[PDB]
């Protein structure tokens, strides 16, 4: 199945959780393909890819090449599809290339049928763009990554979550009265909340520094175990 | 004058810092106007503006009204120009209204030439929108807000800051090894980094819940003092 990850706000931990979840799902004896559609292109650097490597499916289509040749093999049961680097001229003028990336949906669909991968995780930004909407629609299920703060509390009551998406709490902290109050309010105000939450674990902060997923970098850390529980939940509930 | 605060990555605290900076400058006796360029309309909620207040300069411009009537006066020395809550359909297709907000640049030029406002803070998004590029163009100074972590460090080597911007550190922890290493490397490598940094404080997380700027919420807060120092620094250099 195709599981799409998108955050209610940039920087809540969507890419880190995407890499960790892909690593965990693969460790459970499963072929996993993780695709970064967020143009920031920060999912690569969690998988020990050289920074100078500018190859990516978006870049492959922007140069007229084949997007499929941009694939990477991390382990025998984990694959990567880098977004690719965009020039400063490309970064400051997003309209000139946003509409030229629509073809990727058909390739993702044909891959979803290839039967090669049992999970297709997609890291999506919150730019409300055409590509983001098309890729979120392609996903069989969705995960919304939030943190327990006032900003996400407001965003939950003013912006539209993906249809049927599950709220996943990330970056839960220790000794914050406001965080506890908002969590209590969500326990009965929100029906889509997942039973598992990822804590503020220093392993998560270091994992991108080490260019490794949190499961590989330090499997004894609480964050790795929480991501493991989330992977089990995806297996048991998001099978179809 | 026109001090644009923009986050290098979302969630660093551009909005709460902007509210705090507005409050600190208004304590210093300067005429301050905060204009929310963020479409998510969180700046209004920080100045005790009710969630139901749909009015805003962008909504007024789309609806053909005069944005000059969309403001609120918080104290004698602080004015707000909220973005205005947009409908769900409007949020789904931003490309249908991004190009229709051109006159705000002329209005801000008029306000700058007015001289009534010695400071005009602008809370900006990071979406590469044409409106945001224009707003940065009319800004006299820019502050890029980063957090000390791998994400911001990676961004700083690949995404283009506004020209002349100064990097401000927010959400600084105590005893994080990767954070300390990145901080030292930043000190010895980043030329534009500001001498002040804002520590993580429960005051900043509680200010938005109380719908007040962090300075008014608790003036003894460490982040409040840091924001006041930043305001004085802007007075000294950005004037």
């Amino acid at each position: 199945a195709v599981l799409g990850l998108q955050g209610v706000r940039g920087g809540v931990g969507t890419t880190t959780i995407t890499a960790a979840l892909a690593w965990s799902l693969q460790m459970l004896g499963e072929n996993v393909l993780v695709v970064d559609a967020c143009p920031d292109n920060l999912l690569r650097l969690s998988f020990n890819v050289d920074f100078t490597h500018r190859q990516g499916w978006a870049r492959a289509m922007l140069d007229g090449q084949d997007w499929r040749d941009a694939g990477l093999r991390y382990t025998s049961q984990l694959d990567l599809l880098p977004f690719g680097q965009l020039s400063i001229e490309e970064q400051e003028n997003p309209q000139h290339w946003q509409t030229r990336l629509s073809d990727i949906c058909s390739g993702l669909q044909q891959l979803k049928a290839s039967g090669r991968y049992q999970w297709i995780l997609i890291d999506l930004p919150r730019d409300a763009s055409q590509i983001t909407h098309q890729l979120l629609s392609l996903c069989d299920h969705s995960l919304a990554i939030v943190n327990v703060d006032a900003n996400c509390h407001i965003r939950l009551h003013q912006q539209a979550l993906p249809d049927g998406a599950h709220i996943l709490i990330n970056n839960f902290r220790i000794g914050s009265q406001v965080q506890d109050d908002i969590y209590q309010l969500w326990l009965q105000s929100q029906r889509r909340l997942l039973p598992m939450l990822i804590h503020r674990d220093e392993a998560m902060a270091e994992c991108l520094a080490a260019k490794q997923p949190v499961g590989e970098y330090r499997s004894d850390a609480l964050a790795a175990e929480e991501i493991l529980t989330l992977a089990n939940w995806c297996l048991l509930n998001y099978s179809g | 004058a026109v001090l644009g605060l923009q986050g290098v990555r979302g969630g660093v605290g551009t909005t709460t810092i902007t509210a705090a900076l507005a409050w600190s400058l208004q304590m210093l006796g300067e005429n301050v106007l905060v204009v929310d360029a963020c479409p998510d309309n969180l700046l209004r909620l920080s100045f005790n503006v009710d969630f139901t207040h749909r009015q805003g300069w962008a909504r007024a411009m789309l609806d053909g009204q005069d944005w000059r009537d969309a403001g609120l006066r918080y104290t004698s020395q602080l004015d707000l120009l909220p973005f205005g809550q947009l409908s769900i359909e409007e949020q789904e297709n931003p490309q249908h209204w991004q190009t229709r907000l051109s006159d705000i640049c002329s209005g801000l030029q008029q306000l700058k030439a007015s001289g009534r406002y010695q400071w005009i803070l602008i809370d900006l998004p990071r979406d590469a929108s044409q409106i945001t590029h224009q707003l940065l163009s009319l800004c006299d100074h820019s502050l890029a807000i980063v957090n000390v972590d791998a994400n911001c460090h990676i961004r700083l080597h690949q995404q283009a800051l506004p020209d002349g911007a100064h990097i401000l550190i927010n959400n600084f922890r105590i005893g994080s090894q990767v954070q300390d290493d990145i901080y030292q490397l930043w000190l010895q490598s980043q030329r534009r980094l500001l001498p002040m940094l804002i520590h993580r404080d429960e005051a900043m997380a509680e200010c938005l819940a109380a719908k007040q700027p962090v300075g008014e919420y608790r003036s003894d807060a460490l982040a409040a003092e840091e924001i006041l120092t930043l305001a004085n620094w802007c007075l000294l250099n950005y004037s």
């Binding site: 109050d181 209590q184 | 819940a209």
Partner: peptide, 22 residues
């Protein structure tokens, strides 16, 4: 009853929660 009392205390303490609550 403890959870409800804590929720009411928080709602009284933080007006942003009270605004969306009702």
């Amino acid at each position: 009853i403890s959870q409800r009392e804590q929720l009411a205390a928080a709602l009284k303490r933080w007006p942003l929660l009270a605004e969306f609550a009702q």
